[PDB]
Design a protein around this ligand. Structure first.
Ligand SMILES: [Cl-]
Ligand SMILES: [Cl-]
Ligand SMILES: [Cl-]
Ligand SMILES: [Co+2]
Ligand SMILES: [Co+2]
Ligand SMILES: [Co+2]
Ligand SMILES: [Co+2]
Ligand SMILES: [Co+2]
Ligand SMILES: [Co+2]
Ligand SMILES: [Co+2]
Ligand SMILES: [Co+2]
Length: 484
């Protein structure tokens, strides 16, 4: 619900902290801000929330582009600190704010037991004196913070004189800083936000109090539920730990809930958006199934066999001459176009498939035709070769295959990931330090027409995305989870 939303006069804002990389939680917020702006033909601001002192701007911008989210203007919270100071003084002069030098623990306990602080009835002139000390960074100032003067006996703790301005001397222009709670309603009013979105985890009463106490233009708050996932570390400290200890070797690792990582993992922005519109810690299965049903009809198909367990199949009635036929990259989608298929008398099949055969049995080699198995050569116990006869011109065993043309077979590594932690929510006890499985395969020559980040399907094998191309023509392909 966008309260009193008017077509052409809605302004939302996405306000991420430039203190890290966007993760998928951020994605629900950035998407919903764009979704309500577009619904009402409005505007979406990008605001870097730099309220408290701590260059990720570039990464955030690039993720927001990757998600296809455009914004009308970029701002910083710090852009308005002068204005916030002015309002804080106005607050003091309406006796709506006071300087308090009570310590942290005793202030929490006073707030709990609803007892008004000693300084709550400081004069205006004294409050202004002490705020000036806060502004100049003196030890007096560092002892003081400005609180709003609301209602210490209110049933809602956020209305019990919340802190507005704090003195911060230590960490890197300004010696006092507004709090998030004070900065956020004022900046939203002055930037022209009409509908401010945020997580439902209330501060709504206090935010409204700040706006009306200062007679600013009203701003509506819409709450949404935070999106977080099982078995997913999103604490920035622990992500740092992963990187620093060489568990992953970068912040874009496909096991990281970061936006870059997940796209690298194979997720479409469409799948994420659709999951959000259709949707505590959520389960990944619904998201990857939505992704699969989005990408399956519009990606090519290719074949691959295990490079070393594959068995040599020989059609003994054919010659070594290489026949090549055109085929469709997608059997039920002619737009994706054609590839070239190559065949000979010699083929590669999976040992999984080879050890299921027996003499005088008909099977199909997919996209080629049926063959009749005649014998199985086994040396040392394991299957050495399969001899069959061509019958290309009834069967339940349709298997994939590759031509045994080693100088054209493209060599690939398949990376299959699992979750970095093992429980859903000393934590390092539950790290799967072994969540990156590699398998080497041969694939079809035509797969060389694929470019980086192209998505595709390996027949009877699953879904993959081309992450990188190696020297001497080797591909690195990430398996995309499919839900089932
Ligand atoms: Cl929601
Ligand atoms: Cl965490
Ligand atoms: Cl990597
Ligand atoms: Co429209
Ligand atoms: Co910065
Ligand atoms: Co000091
Ligand atoms: Co799982
Ligand atoms: Co023929
Ligand atoms: Co594993
Ligand atoms: Co490599
Ligand atoms: Co390689």
């Amino acid at each position: 619900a966008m309260a009193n939303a008017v077509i052409g006069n809605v302004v939302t804002r996405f306000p991420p902290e430039p203190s890290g990389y966007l993760h998928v939680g951020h994605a629900k917020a950035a998407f919903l801000n764009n979704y309500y702006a577009q619904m009402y033909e409005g505007k979406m601001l990008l605001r870097f929330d730099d309220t408290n002192p701590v260059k990720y701007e570039k990464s955030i911008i690039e993720d927001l582009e990757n998600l296809g989210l455009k914004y009308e203007k970029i701002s910083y919270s710090s852009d308005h600190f002068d204005l916030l100071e002015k309002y804080c003084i106005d607050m003091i002069k309406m006796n709506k704010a006071y300087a308090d030098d009570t310590g942290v623990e005793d202030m929490r306990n006073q707030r709990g037991e609803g007892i008004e602080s000693i300084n709550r009835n400081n004069s205006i002139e004294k409050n202004l004196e002490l705020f000036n000390e806060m502004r100049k960074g003196t030890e007096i100032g560092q002892k003081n913070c400005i609180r709003a003067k609301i209602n210490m006996q209110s049933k809602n703790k956020c209305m019990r004189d919340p802190v507005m301005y704090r003195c911060i001397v230590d960490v890197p222009k300004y010696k006092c800083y507004p709090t998030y709670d004070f900065a956020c309603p004022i900046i939203d009013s002055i930037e022209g936000v009409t509908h401010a979105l945020r997580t439902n985890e209330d501060r709504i009463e206090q935010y409204n109090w700040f706006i009306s106490t200062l007679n600013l233009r009203k701003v509506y708050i819409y709450e949404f539920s935070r999106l977080a996932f099982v078995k997913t570390v999103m604490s920035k400290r622990k992500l740092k730990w992963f990187v620093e200890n060489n568990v992953v070797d970068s912040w874009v690792d496909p096991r990281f809930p970061t936006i870059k990582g997940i796209l690298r993992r194979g997720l479409t922005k469409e799948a994420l958006f659709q999951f959000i519109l259709e949707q505590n810690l959520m389960q990944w299965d619904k998201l990857w199934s939505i992704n699969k049903q989005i990408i399956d009809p519009i990606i090519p198909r290719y074949a691959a066999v295990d490079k070393n367990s594959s068995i040599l199949l020989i059609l003994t009635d054919l010659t070594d001459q290489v026949i090549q036929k055109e085929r469709d990259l997608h059997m039920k989608n002619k737009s994706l176009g054609t590839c070239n298929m190559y065949y000979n008398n010699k083929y590669l099949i999976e040992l999984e498939d080879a050890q299921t055969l027996l003499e005088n049995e008909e099977i199909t080699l997919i996209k080629l035709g049926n063959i009749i198995i005649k014998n199985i050569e086994k040396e040392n116990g394991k299957i050495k070769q399969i001899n069959a006869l061509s019958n290309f011109h009834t069967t339940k065993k349709k298997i994939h295959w590759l031509p045994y043309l080693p100088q054209q077979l493209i060599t690939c590594t398949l990376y299959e990931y699992d979750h970095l932690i093992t429980v859903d929510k000393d934590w390092t006890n539950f790290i799967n330090f072994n969540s990156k499985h590699e398998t080497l395969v041969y694939a079809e020559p035509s797969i060389s027409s694929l470019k980086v980040s192209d998505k595709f399907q390996f027949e009877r094998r699953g879904y993959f995305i081309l992450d990188k191309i190696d020297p001497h023509h080797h591909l690195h392909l990430i398996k995309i989870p499919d839900g089932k």
